[PDB]
Design a binder for this molecule. Structure first.
Ligand SMILES: Nc1ncnc2c1ncn2[C@@H]1O[C@H](COP(=O)(O)OP(=O)(O)OP(O)(O)=S)[C@@H](O)[C@H]1O
Ligand SMILES: Nc1ncnc2c1ncn2[C@@H]1O[C@H](COP(=O)(O)OP(=O)(O)OP(O)(O)=S)[C@@H](O)[C@H]1O
Ligand SMILES: [Mg+2]
Ligand SMILES: [Mg+2]
Lengths: 432, 432
């Protein structure tokens, strides 16, 4: 049974924001998910937005056209789940009345899906006001329009929905599966989680927030094996690694971060990097570097020499293929799910980790495809500062002024099984 | 900051039940937790229970004595968290008024703990009635008393709490961290989860239920390596293993289980066992057998020959020590946390697994200590049927009538590092 997530709420309540975070998350953990924004369908269908009168609850023609856009969206939901193999579909619209919601419920039923509602509630004017400026004035409907007329139009637009707005009821809607998010995620009301995926969705939603903050990611300072061009193992810091550690501490101090939380793996290179700071930290083995199995501590030359077959396959699909007895980046993604969850729950946080692990975390907050994730560039002695924003995440690369070996290997042009060794190792960085 | 979980609710609302499940769970995942039942303190203090008049809200002396018992309980909470290194304490009492709750809140504050409330609400008479019979009439307060007078006394006892019962309020109690469970876990209200442990507590509580059902655990049918007395690896079924598979299918059919869910690991021996059934199943690598690392596929004789040091330590503490590159039963417990969670969420379920994995699952539902867990007996070709009940779990061992090698190794009397090999292998079962 695929899952149909139905967003519910007045305009400017963070529905699209939640829809996006949920869709990205579900896709990260490998559940084919796609969001369907009725507003975008309308925009593609209506061409240009004039004013709120289109949304008047007593505007029969408008309602008609509005119903048509919803249906167009629902039809693609059906195609995705029923014809393209999608697992979850997020239907993003106001869906503020019992009527529409029952209609959508019926759709799910006739199509064989399980329906779950996510209602976002906000009665706070400064937040609503903040949301308008922050996301609405810049949106397509209002770009190239005067801020004040745009703002008035939108408020009048929200008004169109108030008289008919029927929130999920404990008794009237007791048979529906749903979650109601209030106070921007302060409190929640949950009813009838029907299964495992809904339980994980609720778990996810209850742990996300919009409290301003930055996520800092950096690798342990250069290690002894990094110098040798050797992967994995449990090396200690190299002289430069130690230098970096001191540059990181100064950076962290200079940052003057409010209540920063610092995490490291259980590998000495990250811990030794963490020892350099003023602030305390927590070590978690879940943050340990990807396991290379039989090629642990080997150099790429050695790997090509002993595992030419596995090395070629891994290059062909570096997300899915692994070395014998090792993890794939896919296994690592699965392994990092708890990390992703706690990072969402966290506020200001610094994670001192490793190349593969950092690529996984960057891919998550930067919404990078699985195919692209194994190749993201995570240079040594550089801090990547992430500032989650509406629908996206800004990133800043901050070099901490300490030389370091390059551990980034590009995918060689030749990835054919039985490829000459020279072509296999052509993209290997300098070392020793 | 240790955590103080405060139970809240009218008598017979499953508070003690929830308190117990929560405490057991938290301890299973390694968080030192202890529950403090004020009713038990009262029982140890008051000696014998006469009647409900003791609980009259206008009974000043009773209130006084009732306050004394609460305080005695709170003092042990303080000792556990503040002096014995406990992490979480569950204070189990009605705590139905704002007054008492504020008092407890203050206690937590002065002691440096984070307070989290768990309120259980039930307005269903048949359930309340069921609870009385099911747990109350047999309890100490009522054992050896006539069912009818016992029952009347208890109802009048619940009455004592109704006029003063003040449930957690969205506005009045908006600054408190809490969860309200309704309809026996149908719906929930959650407010201000303050941290990681509270997030996991909520996640746990929202996934437990009291829907009648049985958990069936059995190992894959005897495997080729089981015959040889070889551990781990990925062997296929032995001839007897196949025989068992057919006996299991018949057993499952004969059981006539409503909507049974079947789980196996990604190891062929369990899958091959699962192939024998009518019903479909899901394979999860999280259910794979404990990893023996460098001793994979070896025999104990071989292990003693190549790893006399690691083998002795493992025998000294089989929960914590591991073979080089392998998992400890502790690592396995951590690994199985998602399995425990989904098992709680499940109803009728059959899990076809392995020796170490099954020991971990048995220890959880049977509340066996960590020290005892690595040694639980999980014979081949036998199904262990678990029927969760109030405060406990009944277990029935059902042999499926197929011969099998014994893979159970008792802890030898000699576990000294440098112990003679004959004494180390003295408890090794017959094989080959
Ligand atoms: N739970 C929340 N409560 C209130 N605002 C939120 C919440 N989550 C996100 N936001 C903010 O809402 C903004 C994003 O709003 P959108 O997702 O466009 O709202 P919207 O409800 O989809 O309005 P429509 O699509 O026009 S009906 C960003 O400023 C978010 O930080
Ligand atoms: N969420 C729940 N709703 C209602 N009953 C429950 C719930 N969870 C468990 N039970 C049932 O409640 C019984 C256990 O009740 P207890 O835990 O003794 O109640 P109690 O609320 O602790 O009463 P006291 O301690 O006398 S104040 C068992 O029958 C459970 O199956
Ligand atoms: Mg929207
Ligand atoms: Mg109780």
């Amino acid at each position: 049974c695929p899952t149909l997530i139905v967003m519910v709420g007045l305009p400017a309540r963070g529905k699209t924001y939640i829809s996006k975070k949920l869709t990205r998350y579900l896709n990260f953990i490998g559940v084919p998910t796609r969001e369907f924004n009725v507003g975008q369908y309308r925009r593609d269908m209506v061409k240009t937005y004039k004013s709120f009168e289109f949304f008047l609850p007593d505007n029969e023609e408008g309602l008609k056209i509005r119903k048509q856009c919803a249906l167009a969206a629902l039809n693609d939901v059906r195609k995705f789940l029923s014809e393209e193999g999608g697992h979850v579909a997020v239907f993003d619209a106001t869906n503020t009345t019992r009527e529409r919601r029952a209609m959508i419920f019926n759709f799910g039923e006739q199509n064989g899906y399980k329906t779950f509602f996510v209602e976002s509630i906000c009665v706070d004017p400064e937040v609503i006001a903040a949301n308008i400026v922050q996301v609405k004035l810049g949106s397509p409907d209002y770009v190239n329009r005067d801020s004040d007329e745009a703002t008035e139009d939108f408020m009048r637009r929200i008004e169109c929905y108030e008289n008919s707005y029927e929130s999920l009821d404990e008794e009237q809607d007791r048979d529906l599966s749903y979650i109601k998010i209030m106070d921007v995620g302060q409190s929640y009301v949950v009813n009838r989680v029907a299964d495992h995926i809904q339980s994980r969705i609720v778990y996810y939603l209850m742990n996300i927030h919009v409290t301003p903050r930055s996520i800092y990611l950096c690798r342990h300072g250069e290690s002894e094996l990094n110098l040798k061009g050797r992967i994995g193992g449990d090396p200690g810091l190299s002289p430069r690694g130690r230098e970096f550690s001191k540059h990181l501490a100064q950076f962290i101090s200079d940052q003057n971060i409010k209540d920063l939380k610092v995490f490291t793996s259980q590998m000495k290179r990250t811990i030794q990097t963490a020892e350099a700071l003023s602030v305390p930290y927590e070590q978690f083995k879940v943050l340990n570097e990807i396991d290379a199995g039989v090629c642990e501590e080997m150099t790429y030359e050695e790997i090509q020499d002993h595992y030419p077959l596995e090395f070629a396959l891994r290059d062909q699909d570096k997300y899915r293929y692994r070395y014998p007895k090792g993890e794939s980046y896919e296994d690592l993604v699965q392994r990092l799910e708890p990390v992703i969850m706690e990072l969402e729950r966290q506020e200001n946080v610094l994670v001192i980790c490793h190349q593969a692990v950092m690529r996984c975390l960057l891919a998550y907050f930067l919404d990078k495809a699985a195919e692209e994730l194994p190749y993201l560039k995570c240079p040594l002695h550089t801090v990547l500062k992430l500032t989650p924003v509406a629908y996206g995440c800004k990133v800043e690369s901050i070099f901490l002024n300490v030389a370091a070996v390059n551990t980034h290997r590009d995918r060689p042009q030749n990835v054919d099984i039985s490829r000459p060794s020279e072509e296999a190792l052509v993209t290997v960085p300098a070392h020793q």
